[PDB]
Design a protein around this ligand. Structure first.
Ligand SMILES: O=P(O)(O)OC[C@H]1O[C@H](OP(=O)(O)O)[C@H](O)[C@@H]1O
Ligand SMILES: O=P(O)(O)OC[C@H]1O[C@H](OP(=O)(O)O)[C@H](O)[C@@H]1O
Ligand SMILES: O=P(O)(O)OC[C@H]1O[C@H](OP(=O)(O)O)[C@H](O)[C@@H]1O
Ligand SMILES: O=P(O)(O)OC[C@H]1O[C@H](OP(=O)(O)O)[C@H](O)[C@@H]1O
Ligand SMILES: O=P(O)(O)OC[C@H]1O[C@H](OP(=O)(O)O)[C@H](O)[C@@H]1O
Ligand SMILES: O=P(O)(O)OC[C@H]1O[C@H](OP(=O)(O)O)[C@H](O)[C@@H]1O
Ligand SMILES: [Cl-]
Ligand SMILES: [Cl-]
Ligand SMILES: [Cl-]
Ligand SMILES: [Cl-]
Ligand SMILES: [Cl-]
Ligand SMILES: [Cl-]
Ligand SMILES: [K+]
Ligand SMILES: [K+]
Lengths: 322, 322, 322, 322, 322, 322
């Protein structure tokens, strides 16, 4: 199959986290399919179909935990597969991939904006907000509250080992928002002064559990301890269909060298193992609301988002499997 | 007063944390007073007394949170003061300073060994133990358990910002103990597999609260959530006399460049502030036992350790005050 | 612009709490619109439409916290607006107003009676029930259980500052129900002897939170503490549509002279402020069920009441807006 | 009515628990109605209808707690009733009873297999699973997990007074699964080593409460204390329609001689009473998921299973009532 | 038998709550014994002894719940009794009564002032403090913190039924302290903004439980809920010796007309009963410290206050008994 | 060493649980030493000393978990050892053993009575009390409350696998106390109607934990859940000195045949293991008071009982070790 360099490059950058953030990697994967379809030299629809299946698989095998990625792939590929199977000729199949890809990307952008608008209404003037990692959905919320003239301040946790909190701090400061920057260990110490916790998600399960950057569950735990609202900002495509039928979400284990750099780590004795999970699981008892582009829900309503929008696909195999 | 160079160097090295760990700095403070008295060229008792008073103030004004330091200074100087007020001559005042200091150091050392023998009886073969920062008292426990032939493994949290966890990981591994190194954020995620948590202390208050390295209270919180025993290995000189009469323990705020290196921080926007608390407060509800060199106590027995060993001094001014 | 005196006097009575209780004020707003329409001297549809809009705004601007009042105005005005926009003539518009009003009013009465029947089934012979304030929906439950022959006693809390508890004590006693009357402060002391807690609601949010008379949340908290069932009796029009898109519910602050009479308060010094919140927020974790005219639900299905009945309307502006 | 012998024998055998387990008795009840219709010597539709009505009452008055039984009877008799009221002739009424019953039995069987496939995805290699009583739905899960090659061990609680745990221990062991048998009292003691708890259900209520074998709520409580996942494997026909409109589930009180054998009890003093509740109530807070043949749900989604499959019948009388 | 009118009128005033507050009523009982002794017309030791015994019984039988009152009578009477039994003459006995009284009175004043000083050290600049009722010991803390220049505000709960909150609001405002006055029901709504809770005590038991004005326990509960410090300010003579040997503390039930004035209550029907408990019980789990004149203790060291100061006396009968 | 048959027989009966109950086995062990000393044919003190050491070891090696046993042995043997070592002749050594044994036995009887008197004061008229196993200390409490004329009723759990609850039921009924008898699984179900939980102890540790019959920890857990007082009735000799220095208490694992009788168990396949722990650990957070013969303490004061009465012996080896 003649896979274009952009598919390989997108995949390499997902894997390396040069491109990162759950929504962003899903957009990048839709983009990569778009580009495969645009540049394809396929002459028959079967051949293009085969390229899009192979590209889809390469992109799926990058990072496991964030379901946004497979959900993007499926959005495009369910539509591509129904067209190929319904007889579409080459150019109709091509357009179906391109246009489906574009709709995913545009829907992602609008969803993040609307999550901002909805979540911002829950932020009040004077609020100290704590956040974790770098989530564009959570940021959209903070950014909009500040645009509305609420004087907020945000406690940003540094978020080891990849330091995504540095991204968040600089970003929020560039909008005019003051930031207090702390190490992850200090989240309980500062939870007394916090009014709200606003974080994002990689995958949300059928029972309401949120899988998000390593340490999220700790911040949620002590927020609950303190009666501080935990709000999770998350697009519908963050919801995980396979968990409706019992599937466990895989937690990505990333290279030990993100924790201890290579040159240091290679001097350490062999009876030290460095373990580097990229996510943890926050149970729904520690989440007050999830803010989707369709509104505020209790986390227990995750199953409804899943039923009404993804359940249908579960009797069928993946729309890229041959 | 003619303060010797070793007093100034010890003070600087406590301040910079080139010498750190609550028991160690307390021994170093006693050791500094020892050297002042050894080397003093005083010829009157009054002169040496005044030197030791000034030295004591220099040493006390280094780091505020660990009461181990003022307790060491008190141990030497209650004895020095009483000899002086009872009319000791120069050589008798001198020997009293030098010998009180050697006593403190020796008792510290024995206390740590003993804490280890006691706490190790609580550790069971097959145990996975989580720790935090680098506490000689907590290490004493684990090391003794390993030497008893218990096949243990220790999960070492990196302990941002100063990375004391690397000291711990390499020290335990060099004793032959298997280590799992993780970031602080991952403590909840790995609390299910943990059997025991063993951590140290800087100060322990009358109501049974434990002031220890930033992040301690989080680890304890989730250990309690998961019913994992929290054990705090701590010498009786970690107990904080002044909290008996209402005093709050100052939490040390250290330099922002410990979090974000100077070269990076100078480039960051002015509306970002970096907060770097060196300690937090773990309430007694999240502590199962305190292991002193006198035995296992519930945390609410802290007031008894204080009543029996320190209460009598509270009537008086500090033994270095004019 | 030509608004009948009945609208003005209903408004004044809602505002002064001469007419109170969330259901009742909602019925009174419908009643007021009904009377504007019956008595209007308008000659074109336009004029009547402008009167109903204006009258609705007046009624809306009385008390903010109970969503029943705007849900009643919406019930009428959606229907009036649709008729008006579909070119309805004057008597068609008038009667759409009158009839819609009557319909809300009759459904309110029936909903309250049906909540009685459903809720009474959870009451058991010998039950001691605690309640708070004076809620017709909670009272419907208690009255029905007693009419079924269950020997219950009701602990009535006095409900400062407006003493609604007195209304409830006398009302329940009038039906032959034995009453125990206590101050609000005594709710914990008597929670051990309580078998069920039954209270009303002013607004219920998308995430399952209940906004009800100041003090409800304390009762619910110690109820949950003691594993006593907390049941909230509430018509579907107590559910709050705007909270689906992030709106916060405003807590009415009423006159401090309801707390300290004017004659006494004028004598007090300026450095005492009296704060008089009329409602508090009870989180869903401390509510076992809501009893609506459609059934028993967990507090987390509030969002399904909203989606199924009100969600459609969030697309559009309030039906009384221009 | 000429009720056949198999109806009476099935009723007696449900009463005595020679046939027990909530799914099994439901199938046996359907199977009894099947045999009544097969063997009936009725010649009018009216006559067979009246037989099936009487049979249904006999079967329903056996054990009250497991709603699986009346749900089975409803499944057959809604269909029988509608055929009769629509003027079915004898053979058409007959086949409708026999075929509705075969459908119920088949769907039950498939539902259990499916619950097993789904729940098994939640079980992980190395898992220690605790169970209670003898639930075919819970066993389906464990058995499928074992057949997937997951090396599991099951802790089986003896389940006094009727000792259903011995049935479970021998059944699991005969599939090749390692078993640890303990007394019910030892469930807390062994909850630290347990990874997962998997139990069945007799009835599940609108608010998400689970009524299952006496002791269930205790096991769930301590599983929650210890953060051990509680999974309730339960077919949709375990969900209890009438709780939607307020009904409480009767807890069956069985004979004291199940606890203390007659030969011993007759010798005991008159001021000792033996209480033998066959079930308790586990609140939804102590349940992580319910595994239905339609998927994993949070317990608060019980109201949705009821709304979508059973709500419509609540308007009508039982389909066996005059 | 010859009891001076001062004893009778002190008793009547204690009983009617014209003299109230646990410390104050204790000082007034001592004062009453002092005056019996100064004014006695007895001529033998025997006669004075019989008067002091009788006068003590009268004073004891006023209000039951605050142990301060019997601890004051014991302070005097142990000393009088020992003197009398060691053959003291008339003026030796008289003066032992008078002097012992004066001594209790002076120590009470000093204890309250010392609690102020110790407790103020836990108050911090900017603190919002919630309190309940009117406790001189809690007020001592708040007043001292303000005198130290800390800018505090105090939330004062009204404390139905006797409105002690009004005494406290006016008193605190008189010292220049800003006050916020709320109904008791509003304590949860305002707990988020509260930094510390500071309340008094009537009796403290061997296990650490605090008996204080009706409603204290609800405040402490939601304080603990919100991780707000709960501090109890209480002299050593609030500790209850008889609870060491299992005694329960009696909860005074006062006249229902304190709740509903007579003029209104006579009009109410017989089937409403008004219950008026003057105190509730706060378990030690919801108290962080007790502040006594001897220091800060965890609530679980109440038993050590008792053993060290009162335990000796449990051997013998009350010193006023025959 | 010439060990009398009574020592061997006492040991056999301890091991078999023909003699059982923590206090009773300690009395029986003191008795066995008494009898060895009375019947000894020793001619020199060294020879008698050697017999008493050997008997002590035989009795120590019966059952591990209840510390009452070693504490009895030590009470006698500390005194025997001080006499042998201080030169006592044969007959003085003999008398020292006999008389020390008698003092232990008499002190045990008085302690149980006094625990009754003290605990009974905490029981109120109308109380429903739940208990577990058969504890003479807990029974003394119930028996005395009933003798005082309190109308109590006791819920007795059957206590698998040895059925000690049958002993308790019959015993309490023989005093006139009504009993409700339940299986252990039903303790949560009936905790709503319970006022108090009163249980005994085998060993109480330095941190306040209570080791008691298997299932105790479960009853305590749900009692705490329900705000039902947990009272532990326990003699000072139930307190475990070695835990002061870190020792873990061994949990006795008894024969599987107590759970499943031999003839049944031998037909079961080898991949079923029966596990039969005789005790569990109840953490001090689930105990409100321990009632000793010296009074009511919080469980956290266990360390005080240990310090003041047993600490002294810990620098020395066991008084029977050679
Ligand atoms: O979609 P948005 O809201 O941007 O991010 C959601 C989440 O994705 C990120 O994962 P990673 O950094 O790619 O591993 C973080 O966990 C973050 O909270
Ligand atoms: O005395 P040891 O047990 O060695 O250590 C006690 C504690 O002192 C250290 O503080 P820092 O590194 O000096 O700030 C850590 O907080 C450690 O837990
Ligand atoms: O609709 P019903 O059940 O009568 O009352 C519901 C609630 O409305 C009342 O508010 P207010 O007295 O009007 O402020 C109380 O808060 C009461 O619980
Ligand atoms: O339907 P399945 O999953 O087999 O069992 C469900 C439940 O029914 C049984 O009740 P009983 O033994 O009939 O009283 C047990 O409580 C079991 O958990
Ligand atoms: O001793 P001080 O600190 O003043 O008061 C202690 C307590 O006594 C008062 O009781 P009451 O008003 O006499 O019933 C209140 O309960 C107050 O908290
Ligand atoms: O000393 P008393 O109060 O009688 O009993 C205390 C405890 O000893 C018993 O152990 P076992 O039955 O010998 O194993 C039970 O666990 C009981 O609660
Ligand atoms: Cl998962
Ligand atoms: Cl502090
Ligand atoms: Cl809100
Ligand atoms: Cl129910
Ligand atoms: Cl009490
Ligand atoms: Cl132990
Ligand atoms: K664990
Ligand atoms: K576990």
């Amino acid at each position: 199959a003649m896979i274009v360099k952009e598919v390989y490059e997108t995949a390499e950058k997902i894997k390396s986290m040069e491109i990162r953030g759950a929504g962003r990697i899903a957009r990048a994967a839709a983009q990569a399919l778009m580009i495969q379809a645009e540049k394809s030299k396929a002459k028959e629809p079967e051949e293009l179909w085969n390229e899009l299946k192979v590209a889809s698989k390469i992109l799926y095998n990058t990072r496991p935990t964030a379901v946004s990625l497979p959900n993007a792939l499926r959005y495009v590929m369910h539509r591509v597969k129904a067209a190929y199977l319904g007889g579409a000729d080459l150019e109709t199949l091509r357009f179906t991939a391109i246009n489906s890809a574009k709709e995913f990307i545009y829907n992602s952008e609008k969803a993040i904006e609307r999550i901002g608008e909805i979540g911002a209404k829950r932020i009040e003037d004077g609020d100290i907000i704590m956040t974790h990692c770098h989530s564009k959905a959570a940021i959209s919320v903070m950014k909009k509250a500040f645009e509305q003239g609420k004087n907020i301040k945000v406690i940003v946790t540094e978020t080891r080992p990849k330091w995504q909190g540095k991204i968040t701090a600089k970003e929020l400061a560039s909008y005019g928002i003051p930031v207090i920057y702390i190490v992850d260990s200090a989240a309980r110490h500062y939870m007394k002064m916090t009014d709200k916790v606003v974080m994002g998600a990689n995958s949300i399960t059928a029972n309401g559990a949120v899988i998000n950057k390593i340490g999220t569950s700790l911040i949620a735990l002590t927020a609950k301890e303190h009666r501080v609202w935990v709000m999770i900002a998350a697009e519908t495509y963050k919801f995980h269909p396979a968990t409706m039928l019992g599937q466990l979400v895989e937690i990505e284990m990333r290279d030990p060298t993100e924790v201890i750099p290579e040159e240091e780590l290679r001097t350490w004795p062999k009876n030290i193992e460095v373990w580097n999970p990229a996510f943890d699981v926050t149970p729904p008892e520690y989440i007050d609301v999830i803010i989707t582009e369709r509104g505020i829900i209790p986390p227990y309503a995750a199953i409804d988002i899943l039923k009404e929008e993804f359940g249908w696909a579960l009797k069928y195999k993946e729309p890229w499997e041959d």
